[PDB]
């Protein structure tokens, strides 16, 4: 009787899919466009999804440098999320997927035409638009820790990094609904209106205004909470800034991903010394550490993007130089476009009919 996408599986045999070749945090020198792999078969508990779009993340330099298991070495597939209908699956799926559903979801490999991916990460999602992939790695992220880690109330100051960025929107928007005071940096006068236009109190344009400075003059008792992505001399003007009880998120430290080693160097000798007399915290934040709070998050985030009390804002890339990131082969333009800073909202490639 049911239809496990057999007929789909016979007919649809070979794809085209990204893959880590080369150890490298350059994804160009990394990574390799395949013609004519076989479509995977999905097992019993598993989905075959067909990508329809996919998130570019900036970690994914770190993942083709592979410094998420050294040891593993190519070939290996890459990409962490997507969307897209359910082209086959496993008799167990079944119980609770069906061939031609939308669904999303948050595992490596997606940077392929087809993905297997097991019913248990799914996410089912209203249908395939690219604001839903917005949520599943960075909306979760400022979600979970935010409400698990940042202690946010009322009249809090809130300092986000990147924050016209892909989790960064989410950050100030969510910091925003906790009645926050927020500030946010960029590096443009178009993504501070961005920012004015998501609620923030004080959108900072770094390239021309110096961020240490705003939050000395500012700032001076300092801010309860900063959401740290960037890393480096940023990092050390975070430290400076928090106030007494304040708690710095340790989110990433996009700074330093290029270089050979990945880290941004930082100010840590007198760190302990800067916290204990604060009282404040550095609290670092690895999204998978807390898939126990996953999928609440993950519904709460889609009812407040269909009801319109989320922005999610996509960027496909349509003002990149070779203009809208359309094709597994974008998705090595779309990588460049976030280390040249180019991007308002979340970075995402289309694989359309
Ligand atoms: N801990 C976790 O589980 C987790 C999950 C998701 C993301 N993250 C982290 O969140 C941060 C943002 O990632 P994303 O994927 O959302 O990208 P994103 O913020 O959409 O794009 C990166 C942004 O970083 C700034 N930037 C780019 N290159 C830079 C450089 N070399 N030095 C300083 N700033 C640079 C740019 O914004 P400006 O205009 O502001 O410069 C750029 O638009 C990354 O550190 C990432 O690792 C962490």
């Given at each position: ?156 100051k809130v300092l986000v990094t990147?924050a ?7 950050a100030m928007?969510?910091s925003?609904?906790?009645?926050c005071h927020v500030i946010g940096t ?14 923030c109190?004080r959108?900072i ?6 961020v240490?400075?705003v939050l000395?003059?500012?700032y001076?008792?300092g801010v309860d909470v900063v959401y740290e ?5 940023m990092?050390?003007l975070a430290?400076?800034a928090l106030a007494?009880?304040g708690?710095l998120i ?104």
């Amino acid at each position: 009787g049911v239809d496990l996408g057999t007929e789909n599986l016979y007919f649809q045999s070979m794809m085209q899919k990204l893959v880590v070749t080369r150890l490298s945090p350059n994804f160009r020198e990394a990574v390799t466009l395949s013609r004519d792999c076989p479509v995977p078969l999905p097992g019993d508990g598993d989905l075959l999804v067909r990508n329809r779009f996919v998130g570019v993340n900036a970690s994914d330099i770190n993942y083709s440098a592979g410094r998420y298991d050294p040891s593993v070495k190519p070939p290996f597939d890459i990409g962490f999320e997507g969307i897209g209908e359910v082209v086959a699956l496993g008799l167990s799926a079944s119980a609770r997927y069906t061939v031609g559903q939308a669904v999303a979801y948050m595992a490596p490999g997606s940077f392929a035409e087809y993905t297997v991916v097991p019913a248990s990460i799914a996410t089912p999602v209203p249908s395939v638009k690219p604001e839903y992939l917005t949520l599943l790695v960075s909306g979760t992220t400022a979600y979970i820790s935010l409400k698990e880690l940042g202690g946010l109330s009322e009249g809090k100051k809130v300092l986000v990094t990147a924050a016209a960025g892909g989790t960064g929107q989410f950050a100030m928007q969510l910091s925003k609904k906790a009645k926050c005071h927020v500030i946010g940096t960029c590096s443009s006068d178009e993504k501070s209106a961005f920012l004015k236009s998501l609620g923030c109190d004080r959108p900072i344009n770094y390239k021309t205004e110096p961020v240490g400075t705003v939050l000395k003059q500012e700032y001076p008792e300092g801010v309860d909470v900063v959401y740290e992505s960037v890393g480096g001399a940023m990092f050390d003007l975070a430290v400076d800034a928090l106030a007494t009880k304040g708690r710095l998120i340790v989110i990433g430290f996009i700074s330093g991903y290029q270089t050979p080693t990945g880290l941004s160097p930082v100010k840590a000798g007198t760190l302990p010394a800067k916290l204990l007399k604060k009282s404040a915290s550095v609290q670092g934040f690895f999204l998978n550490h807390y898939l126990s709070k996953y999928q609440a998050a993950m519904s709460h985030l889609l009812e407040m993007c269909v009801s319109g009390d989320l922005v999610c804002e996509v960027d496909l890339g349509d003002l990149s130089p070779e203009g809208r990131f359309t094709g597994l082969e974008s998705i090595f333009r779309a990588v460049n476009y976030m280390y040249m800073g180019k991007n308002t909202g979340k970075i995402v490639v289309e694989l359309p009919h």
